[PDB]
Design an enzyme around this catalytic site. Structure first.
Site, PDB file in Angstrom:
ATOM      1  N   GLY A  43       0.635  -1.242   0.050  1.00 34.95           N
ATOM      2  CA  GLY A  43      -0.152  -0.012   0.259  1.00 34.95           C
ATOM      3  C   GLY A  43       0.601   1.341  -0.187  1.00 34.95           C
ATOM      4  O   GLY A  43       1.831   1.237   0.731  1.00 34.95           O
ATOM      5  N   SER A  61      16.027   5.279  -0.449  1.00 32.93           N
ATOM      6  CA  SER A  61      16.283   5.722   1.424  1.00 32.93           C
ATOM      7  C   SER A  61      15.170   5.800   1.927  1.00 32.93           C
ATOM      8  O   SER A  61      14.467   5.634   1.436  1.00 32.93           O
ATOM      9  CB  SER A  61      17.783   6.702   1.082  1.00 32.93           C
ATOM     10  OG  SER A  61      18.232   7.227   2.940  1.00 32.93           O
ATOM     11  N   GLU A 155       4.363  -9.495   7.785  1.00 34.04           N
ATOM     12  CA  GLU A 155       5.260  -8.550   7.080  1.00 34.04           C
ATOM     13  C   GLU A 155       6.233  -9.591   6.304  1.00 34.04           C
ATOM     14  O   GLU A 155       6.705  -9.844   6.353  1.00 34.04           O
ATOM     15  CB  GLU A 155       5.668  -6.511   6.885  1.00 34.04           C
ATOM     16  CG  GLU A 155       6.890  -7.314   8.429  1.00 34.04           C
ATOM     17  CD  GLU A 155       7.772  -5.967   8.920  1.00 34.04           C
ATOM     18  OE1 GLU A 155       7.006  -5.357   8.675  1.00 34.04           O
ATOM     19  OE2 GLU A 155       8.492  -5.994   9.678  1.00 34.04           O
TER      20      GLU A 155
HETATM   21  N1  LIG Z   1       3.736  -0.331   2.887  1.00 29.94           N
HETATM   22  C1  LIG Z   1       3.699  -1.763   2.783  1.00 29.94           C
HETATM   23  O1  LIG Z   1       2.984  -1.878   2.424  1.00 29.94           O
HETATM   24  C2  LIG Z   1       3.604  -2.414   4.201  1.00 29.94           C
HETATM   25  C3  LIG Z   1       3.627  -3.439   4.134  1.00 29.94           C
HETATM   26  C4  LIG Z   1       4.401  -3.824   5.997  1.00 29.94           C
HETATM   27  C5  LIG Z   1       4.887  -3.274   6.511  1.00 29.94           C
HETATM   28  N2  LIG Z   1       4.674  -2.536   6.179  1.00 29.94           N
HETATM   29  C6  LIG Z   1       6.011  -0.825   7.524  1.00 29.94           C
HETATM   30  O2  LIG Z   1       5.960  -0.285   7.188  1.00 29.94           O
HETATM   31  C7  LIG Z   1       7.016   0.701   6.956  1.00 29.94           C
HETATM   32  C8  LIG Z   1       6.869   1.894   6.259  1.00 29.94           C
HETATM   33  O3  LIG Z   1       7.366   1.279   4.944  1.00 29.94           O
HETATM   34  P1  LIG Z   1       7.046   1.586   3.159  1.00 29.94           P
HETATM   35  O4  LIG Z   1       7.362   0.771   2.079  1.00 29.94           O
HETATM   36  O5  LIG Z   1       5.758   2.042   2.988  1.00 29.94           O
HETATM   37  O6  LIG Z   1       8.009   3.268   3.179  1.00 29.94           O
HETATM   38  P2  LIG Z   1       9.414   3.584   2.571  1.00 29.94           P
HETATM   39  O7  LIG Z   1       9.633   4.388   3.345  1.00 29.94           O
HETATM   40  O8  LIG Z   1      10.245   1.779   2.844  1.00 29.94           O
HETATM   41  O9  LIG Z   1       9.558   3.328   1.692  1.00 29.94           O
HETATM   42  C9  LIG Z   1       9.841   4.423   1.201  1.00 29.94           C
HETATM   43  C10 LIG Z   1       8.159   4.926   0.037  1.00 29.94           C
HETATM   44  O10 LIG Z   1       8.847   5.225  -1.759  1.00 29.94           O
HETATM   45  C11 LIG Z   1       7.713   4.818  -2.461  1.00 29.94           C
HETATM   46  N3  LIG Z   1       8.159   4.147  -3.677  1.00 29.94           N
HETATM   47  C12 LIG Z   1       7.925   5.044  -4.973  1.00 29.94           C
HETATM   48  N4  LIG Z   1       7.925   4.644  -5.875  1.00 29.94           N
HETATM   49  C13 LIG Z   1       8.667   3.643  -5.185  1.00 29.94           C
HETATM   50  C14 LIG Z   1       8.930   2.699  -6.296  1.00 29.94           C
HETATM   51  N5  LIG Z   1       9.923   2.921  -7.980  1.00 29.94           N
HETATM   52  N6  LIG Z   1      10.083   1.553  -5.920  1.00 29.94           N
HETATM   53  C15 LIG Z   1      10.301   1.265  -4.859  1.00 29.94           C
HETATM   54  N7  LIG Z   1       9.428   2.454  -3.839  1.00 29.94           N
HETATM   55  C16 LIG Z   1       8.875   3.389  -4.342  1.00 29.94           C
HETATM   56  C17 LIG Z   1       6.884   3.107  -2.057  1.00 29.94           C
HETATM   57  O11 LIG Z   1       5.648   2.918  -2.166  1.00 29.94           O
HETATM   58  C18 LIG Z   1       7.373   3.917  -0.583  1.00 29.94           C
HETATM   59  O12 LIG Z   1       5.695   4.532   0.151  1.00 29.94           O
HETATM   60  C19 LIG Z   1       7.541  -0.844   7.347  1.00 29.94           C
HETATM   61  O13 LIG Z   1       8.859  -0.486   8.104  1.00 29.94           O
HETATM   62  C20 LIG Z   1       7.234  -1.579   7.364  1.00 29.94           C
HETATM   63  O14 LIG Z   1       7.352  -2.015   8.578  1.00 29.94           O
HETATM   64  C21 LIG Z   1       4.572  -0.859   5.233  1.00 29.94           C
END
Ligand SMILES: NC(=O)c1ccc[n+]([C@@H]2O[C@H](COP(=O)([O-])OP(=O)(O)OC[C@H]3O[C@@H](n4cnc5c(N)ncnc54)[C@H](O)[C@@H]3O)[C@@H](O)[C@H]2O)c1
Lengths: 207, 823
Positions: A43, A61, A155
């Site tokens: 998400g 990062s 996760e």
């Molecule tokens: N996002 C999820 O669905 C998810 C699932 C399980 C756990 N978590 C928890 O949420 C925390 C935050 O994770 P996150 O992934 O939301 O933020 P993050 O800081 O890990 O990543 C930053 C953001 O960059 C975005 N992004 C934009 N373009 C991208 C690309 N081309 N490739 C990769 N990423 C891109 C991603 O969507 C992400 O929201 C994690 O520490 C984890 O514990 C999140």
């Protein structure tokens, strides 16, 4: 192309454009036909979804310890759902609903998928994870699945090298523009998407 | 003619020689045509900030003998004529009154064949109720000759009947206190001509002409050139008997000396009798130049007639000699235009057109300009003198000498002439003249009264309202024209103070108006001017309000996405009085919180403790909805305030029932838990939390919806009044009052009409009254529906479901549990 047939797919607060359940069923099948497998949900906000689906998952990062860097997804869409929204308001304070994405990997990467009962992203689990993947953190061409927190839901962390080999398509599960911050209502999950959302069995022991 | 500012002021101080007047005419009767002829003949021109044409200035010059015929005080042979622009159709009733109110005379255009139509008749009633003097012009005579080919007598009798119909209206609805105001051709208060070809005449013009050929004073000559006067051709003898001694028919003077010359030109020219035309032309001394000498048919007839009887002259003559000056008219209009004592120092000053007394300036409308998005005030000085830099009391609609409500003591940036499409700054402007003002659009919405005496009441107010009770979704058919529409809306919004253009959360482009028709014309302007792009427009939708009827059944609780923050709140209704006070500026968001709290406490029964802890209003930072901080010892509470207010702005903009604005909703924050570190309670975290808690609290507080209601004021002849009630009784209409004008048989019915029942109202009222009804409606109040909005079958629920479907929402309204903390 792994998005199936139809119009140009785009992400909006009104919902993902030109993305029916039937189109998803086609895209999913064609993915497996080419040796790909579903591993969970991600998400995020609209522009991020645009970048991920059309430019691919790319390393960046993130705010955590270097040893835990990677692409975070969840098998249970309800967990990933909580992240499918703006993390910061715009100038006027608008917080938009995001989008749920489905993450696929080449089946050739399955030997690299492991699970643990320990809570991830904590120094008390690093040692056991490094044991399972057969090398010191961070993850590379491997993945780890475990409780996102004590008693919490699962996760999955895809090592960045592995994450860049993913194929990501939109989910048929919509976010709610009129309830941003609300939890995913299971009854809003299309029964036909649930039918194609089983996860592979991950190894509990190292190679 | 081109004039300097000095010249304009020079003939502006001579108010006895000014004519404030408008043109009452159906659009299909060449209203625009006759107006053009006036501009091209007497239109005034100045010796970069442009404005929408609202009024035209005309200059007419007459002889010393002519000025003596004027039965009102005069000074000099110069005359300044203000042609005030009129609406194109009756439906624009509110602005039909606006124009008439600042005019003293009216040129009423009627048709030769069709006579007086239904709408021209209705407008005339209004003009007469305003105490405005009429002069008539029977237009489109051309058709009677070319098409119908009528005889001279048949045409004469046609005019007789036409003039008869007009005076039936005039003697009935003109106020007794003005004396006989009926029009008589023999008195020069009726002209005949064809705007198309640009010719027109009065009996006075032909009387002046023959005055010598008969050794007679103009007076008794025009007296003969109408009615039963006959000049026997054989005996060369005047008679009042339509037969000679031997019993033969005698032609009346009108037919013989006026119609016959014209009839001969028409016959000679249109029959291409090249040998008669020259003889006929010299006879009347109509000399053609070079190019003109070759023309034929209508081409020739048009030039001949234009040179023979210039239309503008016949009209100007009547306007100058018969239409009242500001001085003459204000003496009997003042009492009517003053909402205060008749013998007041200001009302007196208005009767006398006193330029020395305290200012009494009337703003009839706001005019769009090129100087940014600002509007220039337009109106008339009924007393005193308006000056550049002069500080004035801007008295709005709600103003009353008692309170200081709707009062703004500001300064006039600039005073300017409204030279049609252009602006001319001037030092000042004495009473009696029409003028424009600069730097008032932010204090007056559309109309109001400017005053310099703090005991002066408003002038007869014209009810308006900026409430967007109807709206539509706009959408380009070609996705590349998007930018053209975006700038088009930005443009549309600027051309009208009462038009609204905004974006819903979902990102839709919304256009909102004050009524069905008003919104109709805006969408037409948008698709042909402001944007000019093919647009997809959804059907008209009524604007509702979401509100609560009691306090929340229980405390509303919501948690942030990261689970580290919590907001506990409760919703409760705000008294209509308070909502009204907020909407009327009494309770003010921009006010000092301590002075404002005193008012809520003393005048409205609020705990001054609560009133002191108002965090914000909403929506748009000023709506009739409030957040109150009732928390106790919450650490770092102030560090989330900007986020909470933001959430409130969005929540009250589109409520949880069906996306409609909230109204009269008080939210009390009872408690808040926050993460010690600011990193975990930023906007992204708090905003959704506060917003969802609000929805939860709202849904728990006995949700209901409000519908907008019009106040409609209908002028109508006694006979057709029955049609009014007939229509109101199937649109949930509610009669307020039914008053009758003293002498006349004109009634004024007032009633409340739900806006969702007003679609196609004027159309039905039109039929039910034969078009004799004159409708005027303004938004009055919001009304809370009794039925349960959550019940799909109830009236309120029927509205909700339809709307929710329309928006593509889940049909059923979410329960409070959805927004409550999931646990
Ligand atoms: N996002 C999820 O669905 C998810 C699932 C399980 C756990 N978590 C928890 O949420 C925390 C935050 O994770 P996150 O992934 O939301 O933020 P993050 O800081 O890990 O990543 C930053 C953001 O960059 C975005 N992004 C934009 N373009 C991208 C690309 N081309 N490739 C990769 N990423 C891109 C991603 O969507 C992400 O929201 C994690 O520490 C984890 O514990 C999140």
């Amino acid at each position: 192309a792994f998005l199936g047939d139809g119009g140009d797919v785009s992400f909006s607060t009104r919902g993902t454009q030109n993305w029916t359940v039937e189109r998803l069923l086609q895209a999913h099948r064609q993915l497996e036909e080419r040796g790909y497998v579903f591993v969970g949900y991600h998400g995020t906000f609209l522009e991020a979804a645009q970048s991920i689906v059309f430019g691919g998952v790319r390393a960046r990062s993130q705010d955590l310890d270097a040893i835990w860097r990677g692409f975070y997804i969840a098998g249970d869409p309800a967990l990933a759902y909580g992240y499918a929204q703006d993390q910061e308001p715009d100038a006027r304070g608008r917080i938009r609903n995001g989008a749920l994405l489905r993450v696929y990997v080449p089946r050739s990467s399955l030997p690299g998928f492991y699970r643990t009962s320990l809570t991830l992203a904590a120094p008390e689990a690093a040692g056991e994870v490094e044991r399972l993947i057969g090398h010191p953190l961070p993850l590379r061409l491997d993945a780890i699945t475990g409780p996102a927190e004590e008693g919490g839901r699962l996760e999955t962390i895809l090592g960045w090298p592995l994450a860049e080999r993913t194929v990501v398509i939109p989910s048929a599960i919509p976010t709610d523009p009129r309830n941003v911050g609300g939890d995913l209502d299971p009854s809003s999950i299309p029964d036909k998407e649930q039918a194609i959302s089983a996860l592979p069995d991950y190894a509990s022991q190292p190679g | 003619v081109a004039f300097t500012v000095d010249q304009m002021r020079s003939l502006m101080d001579k108010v006895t020689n000014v004519r404030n007047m408008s043109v009452i005419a159906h659009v299909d009767h060449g209203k625009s045509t006759l107006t053009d002829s006036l501009v091209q003949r007497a239109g005034i021109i100045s010796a970069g900030i442009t404005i929408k044409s609202t009024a035209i200035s005309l200059y007419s010059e007459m002889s010393d003998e002519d000025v003596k015929e004027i039965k009102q005080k005069t000074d000099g042979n110069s005359f300044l004529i203000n042609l005030i622009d009129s609406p194109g159709h009756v439906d624009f009733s509110s602005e039909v009154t606006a124009a008439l109110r600042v005019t003293d005379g009216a040129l009423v255009v009627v048709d030769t064949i069709e006579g007086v139509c239904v709408q021209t008749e209705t407008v005339l009633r209004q003009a007469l109720g305003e105490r405005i003097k009429p002069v008539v012009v029977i237009n489109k005579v051309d058709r009677a000759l070319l098409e119908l080919q009528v005889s001279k007598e048949d045409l004469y009798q046609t005019f007789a009947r036409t003039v008869e119909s007009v005076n039936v209206i005039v003697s009935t609805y003109a106020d007794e206190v003005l004396g006989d105001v009926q029009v008589y051709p023999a008195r020069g208060t009726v002209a005949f001509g064809s705007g198309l070809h640009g010719w027109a005449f009065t009996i006075r013009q032909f009387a002046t002409r023959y005055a010598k050929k008969f050794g007679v004073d103009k007076a008794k000559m025009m007296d003969r050139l109408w009615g039963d006067s006959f000049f026997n051709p054989k005996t060369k003898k005047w008679t009042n008997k339509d037969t000679d001694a031997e019993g033969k028919p005698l032609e009346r003077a009108f037919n013989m000396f006026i119609l016959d010359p014209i009839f001969r030109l028409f016959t000679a020219i249109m029959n291409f009798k090249k040998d008669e035309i020259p003889v006929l032309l010299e006879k009347l001394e109509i000399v053609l130049k070079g190019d003109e000498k070759d023309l034929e048919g209508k081409a020739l007839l048009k030039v001949v007639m234009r040179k023979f009887l210039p239309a503008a002259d016949a009209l100007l003559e009547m306007i100058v000699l018969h239409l009242p000056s500001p001085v003459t008219a204000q003496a009997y209009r003042a009492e009517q235009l003053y909402e205060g004592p008749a013998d007041d120092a200001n009302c007196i000053a208005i009767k006398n057109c006193d330029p020395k007394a305290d200012l009494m300036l009337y703003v009839s409308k706001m005019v769009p300009t090129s100087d940014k998005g600002r509007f220039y005030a337009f109106g008339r000085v009924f007393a005193g003198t308006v000056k550049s830099g002069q500080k004035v009391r801007i008295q709005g609609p709600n103003y009353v000498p008692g309170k200081k409500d709707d009062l703004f003591i500001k300064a006039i940036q600039r005073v300017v002439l409204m030279m049609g499409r252009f602006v001319e700054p001037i030092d000042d402007c004495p009473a009696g003249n029409i003028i424009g003002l600069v730097g008032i659009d932010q204090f007056l919405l559309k109309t109001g009264t400017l005053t310099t005496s703090e005991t002066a009441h408003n002038m007869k107010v014209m009810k308006f309202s900026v409430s967007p009770v109807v709206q539509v979704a706009v959408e380009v058919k070609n996705a590349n024209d998007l930018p053209k529409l975006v700038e088009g809306l930005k443009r549309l919004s600027k051309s009208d103070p009462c038009v609204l253009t905004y974006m819903s959360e979902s990102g839709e482009h919304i256009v909102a108006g004050t009524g069905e028709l008003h919104l109709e014309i805006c969408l037409q302007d948008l698709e042909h001017d402001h944007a000019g792009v093919p647009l997809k427009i959804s059907p008209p939708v009524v604007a509702y309000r979401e509100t609560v009827e009691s306090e929340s059944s229980q405390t509303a609780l919501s948690k942030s996405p990261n689970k580290h923050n919590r907001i506990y709140l409760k919703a409760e209704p705000i008294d209509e009085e308070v909502s009204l006070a907020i909407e009327n500026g009494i309770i003010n968001p921009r006010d000092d919180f301590k002075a404002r709290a005193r008012i809520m406490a003393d005048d409205y029964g609020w705990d001054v403790t609560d009133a002191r802890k108002i965090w914000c209003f909403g929506p748009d930072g000023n709506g009739p909805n409030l957040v109150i901080d009732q928390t106790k010892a919450v650490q770092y509470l102030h560090e989330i305030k900007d986020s909470v207010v933001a959430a409130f702005q969005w929540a009250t903009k589109e409520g949880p029932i069906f996306g409609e604005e909230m109204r009269s909703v008080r939210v009390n924050i009872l408690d808040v838990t926050l993460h010690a570190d600011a990193i975990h309670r930023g906007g992204g975290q708090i905003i959704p939390t506060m917003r969802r808690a609000t929805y939860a609290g709202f849904l728990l507080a006995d949700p209901k919806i409000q519908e907008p209601v019009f106040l409609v004021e209908i002028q109508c002849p006694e006979q057709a009044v029955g049609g009014i009630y007939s229509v109101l009784n199937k649109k949930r209409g509610q009669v307020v009052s039914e008053e009758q004008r003293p002498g006349t048989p004109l009634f004024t019915v007032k009633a409340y009409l739900p806006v969702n029942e007003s679609f196609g109202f004027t159309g039905e009222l039109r039929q039910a009254t034969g078009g004799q009804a004159f409708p005027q409606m303004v938004f009055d109040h919001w009304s809370t529906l009794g039925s349960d909005p959550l019940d799909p079958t109830s009236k309120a629920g029927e509205i909700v479901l339809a709307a929710r479907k329309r928006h593509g929402m889940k049909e059923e309204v979410p329960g409070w549990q959805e927004y409550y903390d999931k646990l």
